[PDB]
Design a protein around this ligand. Structure first.
Ligand SMILES: *[C@@H]1O[C@H](CO)[C@@H](O[C@@H]2O[C@H](CO)[C@@H](O)[C@H](O)[C@H]2NC(C)=O)[C@H](O)[C@H]1NC(C)=O
Ligand SMILES: *[C@@H]1O[C@H](CO)[C@@H](O[C@@H]2O[C@H](CO)[C@@H](O)[C@H](O)[C@H]2NC(C)=O)[C@H](O)[C@H]1NC(C)=O
Lengths: 262, 49, 49, 52
């Protein structure tokens, strides 16, 4: 079933990656980072891959009107009616499933995808993609006719079943956070917040290790320690824009929807 | 058509690494020294250079 | 040859060997970033198409 | 984006639309020796003037 098709996405979480231009020509970390655009369909159905997942709610449950994304260390929700894809003009969304978006868009030089935040903010990224689809045949028409010939011409199907092609996933790394540090006169205090943390401090001796409770370290300045979350039980997509953990071993594989058909 | 597969970069702090050749089409690996990676939370590791 | 017809080759559609010559060159990352850059000539199959 | 005309519009107290449009041939040219459209994630740095 459709709900049964979402079993795989139970052990995955979204991520935040560096994308060069995120709306106003300023580099900014975003949860809607674009990775690849595939255009193997002859009719011109674009296939877009981005960090946020469609169809999954924060509590890891199937739902078709929510988009979940990473923000900080947690996962929030956004309405699906606030998804826009544009290439020199608004374009139409034919079907969305997990990491991937299917759209058909007018000719243009750049591609942009945007979603709305919990605080009604707008998060977007733009990349460069020379899009110009030549229709199949020997005539460069634009709109279907009401009297014509039938010719073979391939496209993406909206079926969500398992396909041969797949992508790979791997364990997320330790993510530094500087906000779990506080100064108390001549001491530094770390706040667990419910997540295991790892530290390394050069003040004193024997101040390395991993703990999961609030502690204080004396005779240390705030700049003399570094902490990072470690638990990371979920999975992440193997992205060139995020560092890889210690283990060089592939951990899991996830199928990708929307295969090719005549 | 071809697709170039490029995995996530391996960064090691306060240390060094070397990579070995593999039987794979057009394998190209290199080791770059003296880097200071940055993430959204802050710096990634202690050692400066 | 890179960039022309025949950049990547295979004896048959099901064969597991592949001869590739696309001039994959890596480059040093920009300071204060986590990204792997590379320059590579476009697919010669599209050029032939 | 590139175009031939420019338009500025605000909304009246009565929720009307007040707009005024002129002609202005706008076609930007990026600095350097390449005509790109979106900034890259790996490149050089050229001096360049902007409005603060
Ligand atoms: C914790 O950080 C210290 C540096 O503050 C690391 O000590 C370095 O260790 C490497 C080899 O292990 C030496 O080449 C450096 O000279 C050391 N630096 C200093 C300032 O002594 C230490 O390795 C780190 N430990 C962990 C577990 O990350
Ligand atoms: C759409 O149909 C065509 C023709 O029926 C498919 O092309 C054939 O695919 C079979 C595999 O099922 C091959 O054994 C044949 O050799 C193919 N034909 C030729 C002339 O090579 C085509 O693969 C179908 N499209 C998709 C996406 O499967």
């Amino acid at each position: 079933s459709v709900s049964q098709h979402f079993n795989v996405y139970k052990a995955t979480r979204p991520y935040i990656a560096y994308c060069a231009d995120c709306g106003a020509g300023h580099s900014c970390h975003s949860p809607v980072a674009i990775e690849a655009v595939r255009s193997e369909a002859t009719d011109g159905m674009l296939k877009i891959q981005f960090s946020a997942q469609i169809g999954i709610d924060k509590s890891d449950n199937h739902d078709y009107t929510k988009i979940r994304y990473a923000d900080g260390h947690a996962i929030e929700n956004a309405v699906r009616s606030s998804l826009k894809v544009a290439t020199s003009g608004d374009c139409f969304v034919h079907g969305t499933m997990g990491h991937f978006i299917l759209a058909k868009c007018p000719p243009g030089e750049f591609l942009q995808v945007s979603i709305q935040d919990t605080r009604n903010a707008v998060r977007a990224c733009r990349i460069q993609y020379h899009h110009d689809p030549q229709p199949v045949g020997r005539e460069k028409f634009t709109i279907r006719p009401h009297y014509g010939k039938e010719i073979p011409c391939t496209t993406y199907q909206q079926t969500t079943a398992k396909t041969v092609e797949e992508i790979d996933m791997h364990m997320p790394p330790d993510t530094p956070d500087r906000t779990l540090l506080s100064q108390q006169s001549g001491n530094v205090k770390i706040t667990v917040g419910g997540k295991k943390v790892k530290y390394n401090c050069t003040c004193g001796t024997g101040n390395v290790g991993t703990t999961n409770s609030d502690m204080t370290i004396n005779t240390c300045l705030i700049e003399q320690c570094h902490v990072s979350v470690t638990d990371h039980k979920k999975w992440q997509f193997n992205s060139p824009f995020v560092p890889r953990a210690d283990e060089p071993a592939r951990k899991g594989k996830v199928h990708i929807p929307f295969p090719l058909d005549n | 058509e071809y697709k170039t597969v490029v995995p996530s970069p391996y960064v090691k702090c306060c240390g060094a690494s070397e990579c070995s050749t593999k039987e794979k089409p057009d394998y190209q690996c290199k080791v770059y020294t003296g880097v200071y990676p940055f993430m959204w939370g802050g710096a990634y590791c202690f050692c400066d250079s | 040859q890179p960039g022309r017809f025949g950049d990547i080759q295979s004896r048959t559609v099901e064969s597991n060997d592949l001869y590739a010559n696309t001039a994959l060159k890596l480059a040093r990352p920009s300071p204060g970033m986590v990204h792997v850059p590379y320059t590579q000539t476009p697919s010669g199959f599209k050029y032939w198409l």
